[PDB]
Design an enzyme around this catalytic site. Structure first.
Site, short mmCIF file in Angstrom:
data_model
loop_
_atom_site.label_atom_id
_atom_site.label_comp_id
_atom_site.label_asym_id
_atom_site.label_seq_id
_atom_site.Cartn_x
_atom_site.Cartn_y
_atom_site.Cartn_z
N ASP A 112 -0.28 7.67 19.79
CA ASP A 112 -1.17 7.34 18.67
C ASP A 112 -1.63 5.87 18.66
O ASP A 112 -1.41 5.16 17.68
CB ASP A 112 -0.54 7.75 17.32
CG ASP A 112 -1.46 7.70 16.10
OD1 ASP A 112 -0.94 7.57 14.97
OD2 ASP A 112 -2.70 7.76 16.28
N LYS B 31 9.44 0.00 4.53
CA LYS B 31 8.80 1.32 4.47
C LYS B 31 9.79 2.41 4.01
O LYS B 31 10.67 2.77 4.79
CB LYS B 31 8.18 1.67 5.84
CG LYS B 31 7.47 3.02 5.90
CD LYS B 31 7.31 3.48 7.34
CE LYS B 31 6.48 4.73 7.44
NZ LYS B 31 6.28 5.15 8.85
N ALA C 170 0.39 8.98 1.95
CA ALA C 170 1.03 10.28 2.18
C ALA C 170 2.51 10.14 2.58
O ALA C 170 3.34 10.94 2.14
CB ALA C 170 0.27 11.06 3.24
N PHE C 171 2.82 9.13 3.41
CA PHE C 171 4.15 8.80 3.92
C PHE C 171 5.15 8.44 2.80
O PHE C 171 6.31 8.87 2.84
CB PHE C 171 4.05 7.63 4.93
CG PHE C 171 3.24 6.43 4.45
CD1 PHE C 171 3.85 5.39 3.77
CD2 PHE C 171 1.87 6.36 4.68
CE1 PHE C 171 3.10 4.31 3.30
CE2 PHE C 171 1.12 5.27 4.22
CZ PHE C 171 1.75 4.25 3.54
N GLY C 172 4.67 7.67 1.83
CA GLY C 172 5.43 7.14 0.71
C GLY C 172 4.83 5.82 0.28
O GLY C 172 3.70 5.79 -0.21
N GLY D 107 0.79 -1.22 0.00
CA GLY D 107 0.00 0.00 0.00
C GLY D 107 0.82 1.27 0.00
O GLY D 107 1.91 1.31 0.59
N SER D 108 0.31 2.31 -0.66
CA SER D 108 0.96 3.62 -0.77
C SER D 108 0.01 4.73 -0.30
O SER D 108 -1.20 4.64 -0.52
CB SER D 108 1.40 3.88 -2.21
OG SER D 108 2.12 5.09 -2.33
C1 LIG Z 1 -1.77 2.38 4.76
O1 LIG Z 1 -1.67 1.70 3.49
C2 LIG Z 1 -1.44 0.27 3.45
C3 LIG Z 1 -0.07 -0.17 3.99
C4 LIG Z 1 0.12 -1.69 3.82
N1 LIG Z 1 -1.03 -2.42 4.42
C5 LIG Z 1 -0.77 -3.79 4.58
N2 LIG Z 1 -1.45 -4.72 3.88
C6 LIG Z 1 -1.21 -6.02 4.04
C7 LIG Z 1 -0.22 -6.44 4.92
C8 LIG Z 1 0.49 -5.46 5.64
N3 LIG Z 1 1.49 -5.88 6.53
C9 LIG Z 1 2.35 -5.08 7.31
C10 LIG Z 1 2.19 -3.70 7.40
C11 LIG Z 1 3.06 -2.96 8.20
N4 LIG Z 1 3.17 -1.62 8.47
C12 LIG Z 1 4.21 -1.40 9.34
C13 LIG Z 1 4.60 -0.04 9.79
C14 LIG Z 1 4.40 0.52 11.07
N5 LIG Z 1 4.88 1.73 11.07
N6 LIG Z 1 5.37 2.01 9.78
C15 LIG Z 1 5.19 0.91 9.02
C16 LIG Z 1 4.80 -2.59 9.66
C17 LIG Z 1 4.08 -3.63 8.92
C18 LIG Z 1 4.15 -5.03 8.81
N7 LIG Z 1 3.32 -5.69 8.01
N8 LIG Z 1 0.18 -4.17 5.45
C19 LIG Z 1 -2.32 -2.08 3.77
C20 LIG Z 1 -2.63 -0.59 3.94
#
Ligand SMILES: COC1CCN(c2nccc(Nc3cc4[nH]c(-c5cn[nH]c5)cc4cn3)n2)CC1
Length: 296
Positions: free
Chosen positions: A137, A49, A26-28, A23-24
């Site tokens: 948050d 990320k 505002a952050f990147g 997913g994409s």
């Molecule tokens: C906001 O837009 C999208 C970001 C990615 N999303 C997602 N879909 C499936 C699996 C997954 N797994 C996943 C996501 C994670 N995000 C972070 C994270 C926390 N702070 N910054 C990044 C760690 C992490 C691990 N697995 N994520 C969907 C929404």
């Protein structure tokens, strides 16, 4: 106070392989990937990320806080890659965030799963309190799902979500561990309502006056007075009156022993979500989860 002896790992771009984009915004952009260390004969499923100097500082601060934590109910930073863009390499949480999870799977989510999630967040939050770390948050969007039976707290960008914030945070910008308890109450509400938007339709500017009057989020239909009472105690004006995370662990744990006494869901027990006892739940050769990969 105590020196922060945490190790910040710098990982090579060649050491990992970005499979796809998750997913994409505002952050990147956040990618799905595989980290294959040096010659360790392991493939670790990761979340990557990923130029302005101000944005680099913000992402490096998140890396600092993330490398400074270690708990089974908190996401740890596996490392950073110092490319032209810079990126945080973290453990892949395959089922995404809990907010989307409860929305997409409400018909199979039982009382046991909900109460167990509440314990796991209270445990993760109690760890951050031990480490003297205010989350600022906490929400169901910032709790990720490793397995339906295992969730972890994430997003250390803060260490404004008005509808998740305590009154002192809205009015005086005061953020305490007890202000995280309020956000915990709202997180529990999000789960019990299977993903409902708190104070839906009400503009953020009205929230301050609404809470001052004594108005709070309604009682979810699945909630007994026992569970709602805990949610209410989290939303007291006096922060010291609110429960401690160590008490919220105890409270939800007592309840998680007899879940049907504290949550009334039609069709409960007959419901089932994926487990490591399922067919094809997980090259699959030499793939280890981050939680089992540790360097001395
Ligand atoms: C906001 O837009 C999208 C970001 C990615 N999303 C997602 N879909 C499936 C699996 C997954 N797994 C996943 C996501 C994670 N995000 C972070 C994270 C926390 N702070 N910054 C990044 C760690 C992490 C691990 N697995 N994520 C969907 C929404």
């Amino acid at each position: 106070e105590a020196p922060n002896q945490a190790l910040l790992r710098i990982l090579k771009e060649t050491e990992f392989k970005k499979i796809k984009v998750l997913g994409s915004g505002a952050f990147g952009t956040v990618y799905k990937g595989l980290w294959i260390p040096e010659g360790e004969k392991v493939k670790i499923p990761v979340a990557i990320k990923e130029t302005s100097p101000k944005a680099n500082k913000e992402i490096l601060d998140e890396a600092y806080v993330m490398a400074s934590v270690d708990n089974p109910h908190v996401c740890r930073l596996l490392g950073i890659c110092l490319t032209s863009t810079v990126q945080l390499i973290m453990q892949l949480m395959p089922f995404g965030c809990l907010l989307d999870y409860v929305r997409e799977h409400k018909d199979n989510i039982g009382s046991q799963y909900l109460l167990n999630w509440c314990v796991q967040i209270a445990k993760g939050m109690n760890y951050l309190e031990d480490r003297r770390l205010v989350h600022r948050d906490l929400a169901a969007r910032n709790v990720l799902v490793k397995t339906p039976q295992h969730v972890k707290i994430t997003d250390f960008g803060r260490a404004v979500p008005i509808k998740w914030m305590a009154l002192e945070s809205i009015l005086h910008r005061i953020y305490t561990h007890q202000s995280d308890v309020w956000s915990y109450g709202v997180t529990v509400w999000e789960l019990m309502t299977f993903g409902s938007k708190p104070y839906d339709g009400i503009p953020a500017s009205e929230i301050s006056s609404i809470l001052e009057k004594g108005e709070r989020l309604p009682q979810p239909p699945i909630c007994t007075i026992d569970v709602y009472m805990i949610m209410v105690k989290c939303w007291m004006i006096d922060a010291d009156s609110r429960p401690k995370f160590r008490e919220l662990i105890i409270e939800f744990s007592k309840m998680a022993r007899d879940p049907q006494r504290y949550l009334v869901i039609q069709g409960d027990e007959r419901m089932h979500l994926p487990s490591p006892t399922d067919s094809n739940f997980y090259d699959m050769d030499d793939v280890v989860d981050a939680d089992e990969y540790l360097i001395p």
